């Protein structure tokens, strides 16, 4: 629809180009100037034109040591290494490499690993023509033949085999989303006859570019173009949609320029004639071929930078591609920027111990960038459900019906289009509100990796990139060590608690950035690790090296500076600047998203240390890891000895303090005073006192005062939070307990939060007992919503769940009769509830889908929920304040309240009536019993105040759907399984149905036909 502005008057012999790049690309090419791999770079100007840039003359290489013989110091054998062996038996050694310009170069460099000296050594630099020839050469120089005139006897290892685009960016100092400049007279626009579809197309040599480091005025962001879209399909009853039978009926698109607070384009393309919508364009077609063609032409002409959505990768784009393949439309799958290239669906998997394992499809688009917001949420955030409704409530606050809204009239289709446009608008709001893209651009500028790697890769490519960028400045080469496999080492210490309930303030002192500052201030690195022999026979121990608790020796900083101290120092300053910016916000959600930014930079700095100990990885050095955790243990026991030893009764102070807890970075010391001001004063004195026994940047700091405190086990405690004194209290802290885990029911987590509220804030155990009694009583009397009963568990890799029978695996692998095409896959979460049956050996035989127990009305196992979900967390919490008469107190508060329960042959009910007073079954329909007839006015009085309260609950719920829907004049259709509103509006109809019929036992209060 709307086009980019027109590039007026660029003349290359006088004017430069200044543009900001988004994507890079590799390309094997003809039309050479009179190398074959030429590079592509796509970007945008400071105004809004689209620029493609072709870069020429770059070829991959690596290094290898020159062996000590008469060969690789003699030029005849250098060019003979270039020369091929013409023998017949060298077909395995000069064919797959063959005649390639590997070349011969002599340079003086060093290896990374260890500390041998300040002296370098000769290495050979071996270029290669193509990037897809470094793999057979590696298969032909190490295990292949290297008998060539006795120049290089096998073997010499390969060093610095890295990726092509990463080697380009390490070479020329270009980072992700960078400002690039072509100077005047260096670039030729009309040398390249147009093979792509951008406006400006330059054709430059790889030594002409100028990279501007992002800082000062070069810290801006260009006006990018962002698209979001959503589709609709018309299915059958029960049957989930399938790309060979179910047509695509509506596509809806939103588009904006980045930096402007509203969109500028709003389009909706439908398949029958429709009705107009104010604010958007509407076009209609009588066939699906025209609809797919129209969308492909719009996406070529608008030419967006970024494409977003929600589950567009695994549902939307391959559905469109398969549907275009079935209907024989040849011109659809050309969505990219290159004019002669069609797109294809390709599977990929990712797995780690940090995010688990996920299997995704990818679809190829060259030039353009994809950001599915579902994958960003699934990677960064740990939530309970990952539906669009659930995250839109958590962050903002909100198939067979559609097939008859489309086979109807055109106002129904207009309603369908407004629904689809709201769906297509929600991920834009989430992208701009959560500060996604600004943090992605800052991550790519601090680490130096492209913008597509932050959605596909892990935390290794970034630390490899930063280490290579720091390695070119002193002249070192990296080695290739690979081992399967070493052993584990010893991790962190935890101090033994003094368990219980405390009501005198405890002050928390901890170290900030512990492991990066250990690695900084004792000069630990790959490049300064001293081997056990190379100290000998030199004897200089003092101020030349140090010794660690695991046992290594490491050189002092008066000889070398390591590489990991400098990378860590850069990351630490970036996080410090993020916190300095965060210290001046007032909005809460903005404060937590800047907390998210600084959390991400601290995770990056700690993953630098975790790179060293990963024995399945790219470069492990477990000696360093052992030295780190040994220093950690030594320093925390130093802290505990010092804190408990100095402030004592004989040293003039009030009370000898005693440490109650410590977990590898923090110390919770109990001081003795019950005044929060005096505890805060002595705690600040203690933190600042103890910090002066270390190198720098090692510092201990005061952080909080808990008052009161509740310690249950290791990694399980709770307390109340004081930041200042006249800032009285902030909130609770629930570390580890049953209120922050997601393996349980909402009922149990709510009861634990409410019990700690009534028990820690108001200090009333009697209201707490009465609360827990009411929860158990309302459980047994069958008046608890089934939202509070839903359990969710993650469906991981299928073989560990083959090894032992679980409940959620049994529910998932059991398909439905309605739909063998929508079922949980690997990596998602399965929700279930437990119904009552008589198979007590197996709780995996009583699990059912919440919607299935909704539509089929199966009962609930209240004894399962009473003794297996609720009871034992309560016995954790309520015991330490009292004795074991407290277990008997809650099991007796159960006992006064356990005696009130409510509930083939079952169909043959005789509708046996019963007396309302004393429950005696009898013949006739009158409500009262003959012995209990006098007290009938009181028995009518009783239960009409129950009908009165059910009437008041019907009306508050069924008009809330009208305000959440938007309209007051049309029907509600919302079966949202993540809304408590749904199925709480279903049971009050039946309560009212039952309670209205019980009062017609009594006669009518008058006539009605008068």
């Amino acid at each position: 629809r709307w086009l980019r502005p027109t590039p007026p008057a660029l003349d290359p012999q006088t004017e430069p180009l200044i543009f900001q790049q988004l994507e890079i690309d590799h390309y094997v090419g003809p039309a050479q100037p009179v190398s074959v791999p030429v590079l592509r770079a796509f970007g945008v100007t400071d105004e809004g034109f689209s620029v493609c840039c072709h870069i020429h003359g770059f070829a991959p290489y690596f290094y290898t040591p020159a062996p000590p013989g008469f060969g690789p110091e003699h030029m005849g054998d250098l060019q003979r290494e270039l020369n091929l062996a013409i023998s017949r038996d060298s077909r395995g050694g000069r064919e797959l490499t063959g005649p390639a310009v590997l070349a011969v170069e002599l340079c003086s460099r060093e290896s990374m690993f260890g500390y041998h000296g300040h002296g370098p050594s000769p290495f050979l630099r071996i270029t290669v023509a193509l990037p897809r020839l470094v793999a057979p050469a590696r298969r032909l120089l190490e295990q292949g033949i290297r008998v060539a005139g006795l120049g290089t006897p096998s073997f010499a290892p390969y060093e610095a085999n890295v990726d092509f685009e990463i080697r380009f960016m390490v070479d020329t100092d270009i980072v992700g989303c960078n400002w690039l400049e072509l100077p005047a007279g260096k670039y030729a626009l009309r040398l390249k006859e147009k093979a792509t579809q951008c406006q400006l197309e330059a054709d430059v040599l790889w030594s002409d570019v100028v990279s501007h480091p992002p800082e000062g005025p070069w810290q801006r962001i260009a006006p990018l173009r962002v698209l979001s879209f959503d589709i609709e399909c018309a299915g059958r009853k029960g049957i989930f949609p399938e790309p060979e039978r179910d047509p695509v009926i509506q596509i809806c698109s939103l588009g904006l320029r980045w930096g402007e607070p509203e969109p500028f384009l709003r389009l909706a393309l439908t398949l029958r004639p429709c009705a107009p919508i104010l604010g958007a364009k509407v076009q209609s077609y009588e066939k699906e071929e025209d609809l797919l063609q129209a969308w492909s032409t719009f996406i070529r002409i608008m030419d967006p930078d970024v494409i977003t959505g929600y589950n567009i990768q695994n549902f939307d784009l391959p559905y469109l591609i398969s549907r275009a393949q079935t209907l024989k439309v040849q011109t659809f799958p050309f969505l990219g920027r290159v004019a002669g290239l069609c797109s294809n669906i390709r599977d990929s998997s990712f797995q780690s111990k940090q995010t688990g394992r996920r299997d995704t499809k990818v679809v190829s688009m060259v030039g353009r960038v994809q950001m599915d917001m579902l994958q960003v949420l699934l990677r960064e955030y740990k939530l309970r459900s990952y539906t669009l409704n659930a995250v839109s409530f958590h962050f903002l606050g909100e198939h067979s019906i559609i097939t008859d809204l489309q086979n109807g009239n055109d106002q129904t289709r207009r309603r369908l289009a407004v629904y689809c446009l709201k769906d297509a608008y929600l991920p834009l709001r989430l992208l701009e509100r959560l500060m996604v893209l600004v943090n992605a651009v800052e991550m790519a500028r601090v680490t130096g990796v492209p913008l597509s790697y932050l959605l596909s890769r892990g935390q290794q490519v970034k630390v490899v990139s930063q280490l290579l960028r720091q390695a070119m400045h002193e002249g070192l080469l990296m080695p290739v060590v690979k081992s399967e496999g070493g052993e584990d080492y010893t991790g962190a210490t935890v101090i033994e608690p003094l368990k219980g309930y405390y009501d005198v303030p405890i002050a928390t002192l901890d170290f900030s950035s512990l492991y990066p500052s250990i690695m900084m201030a004792h000069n630990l690195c790959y490049t300064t690790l001293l081997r056990p022999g190379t100290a000998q026979k030199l004897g200089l121990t003092e101020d030349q090296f140090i010794r660690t608790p695991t046992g290594d020796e490491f050189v002092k900083t008066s000889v070398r500076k390591g590489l990991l101290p400098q990378i860590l120092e850069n990351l630490l300053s970036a996080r410090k600047r993020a916190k300095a910016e965060l210290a001046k916000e007032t909005d809460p959600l903005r404060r937590q998203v800047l907390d998210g930014r600084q959390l991400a930079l601290k995770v990056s700095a700690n993953s630098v240390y975790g790179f060293t100990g990963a024995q399945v990885g790219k470069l492990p050095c477990l000696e360093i890891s052992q030295s780190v955790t040994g220093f950690g243990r030594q320093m925390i026991e130093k802290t505990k000895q010092l804190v408990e030893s100095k402030y004592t009764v004989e040293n003039g102070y009030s009370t000898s303090a005693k440490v109650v807890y410590g977990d590898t970075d923090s110390v919770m010391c109990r001081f003795g005073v019950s005044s929060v001001a005096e505890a805060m004063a002595l705690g600040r004195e203690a933190a600042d006192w103890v910090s002066g026994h270390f190198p720098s940047p090692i510092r201990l700091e005061f952080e909080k005062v808990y008052f009161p405190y509740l310690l249950i086990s290791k990694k399980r405690y709770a307390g109340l939070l004081f930041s200042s004194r006249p800032d009285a209290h902030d909130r609770m802290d629930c570390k580890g307990l049953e209120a922050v885990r997601r393996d349980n029911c909402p009922l149990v987590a709510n009861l634990v939060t409410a019990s700690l509220r009534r028990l820690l804030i108001d200090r009333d155990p009697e209201g707490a007992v009465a609360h827990a009694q009411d929860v158990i009583s309302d459980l047994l009397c069958n008046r608890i919503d089934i939202s509070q009963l839903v359990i969710t568990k993650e469906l991981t890799r299928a073989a560990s769940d083959y090894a032992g029978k679980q409940a959620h695996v049994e529910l998932a692998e059991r398909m439905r009769k309605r739909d063998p095409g929508s079922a949980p896959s690997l990596g998602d979460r399965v929700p279930y509830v437990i119904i009552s049956a008589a198979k007590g050996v197996a709780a995996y035989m009583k699990s059912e889908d919440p919607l299935f127990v909704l539509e089929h009305s199966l009962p609930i196992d209240t004894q399962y929920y009473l003794e297996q979900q609720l009871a034992k967390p309560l016995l954790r919490i309520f015991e330490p304040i009292l004795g074991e008469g407290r277990a008997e107190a809650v099991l007796l508060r159960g006992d006064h309240t356990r005696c009130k329960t409510v509930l083939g042959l079952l169909a043959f009910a005789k509708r046996r009536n019963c007396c309302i007073g004393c429950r005696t079954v009898l013949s006739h329909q009158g409500a009262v019993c003959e012995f209990c007839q006098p007290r009938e006015s009181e028995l009518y009085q009783k239960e009409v105040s129950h009908l009165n309260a059910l009437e008041e609950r019907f009306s508050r719920l069924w008009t809330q759907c009208q305000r959440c829907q938007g309209s007051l004049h049309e029907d509600v259709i919302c079966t949202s399984r993540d809304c408590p509103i749904f199925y709480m509006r279903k049971k009050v109809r039946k309560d009212l149905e039952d309670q209205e019929q019980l009062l017609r036992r009594f006669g009518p209060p008058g006539p009605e036909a008068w």
Binding site: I401, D404, N407, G408, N409, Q411, T412, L854, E855, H969, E970, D971, V972, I973, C974, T975, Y983, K986
Partner: protein, 66 residues
């Protein structure tokens, strides 16, 4: 039949007769006739040549827990 099942499905979604997914089909036909909006005399003449069948004398979504 199979042509009489689309006439009723077309009467059920025309907005000028009312917002009807809680009641029967013949009750909505007589409600519009009282106010006399314009009920057509064909959605009546198939609700008379049938008995109490639940796929003629019921709204489209008379399943569906809404």
């Amino acid at each position: 039949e199979e042509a009489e099942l689309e006439l009723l499905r077309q009467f059920d979604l025309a907005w000028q007769y009312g917002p009807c997914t809680g009641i029967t089909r013949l009750q909505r036909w007589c409600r519009a006739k009282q106010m006399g909006l314009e009920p057509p005399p064909e959605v009546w003449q198939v609700l008379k040549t049938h008995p109490g069948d639940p796929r003629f004398q019921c709204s489209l979504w008379h399943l569906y827990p809404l």
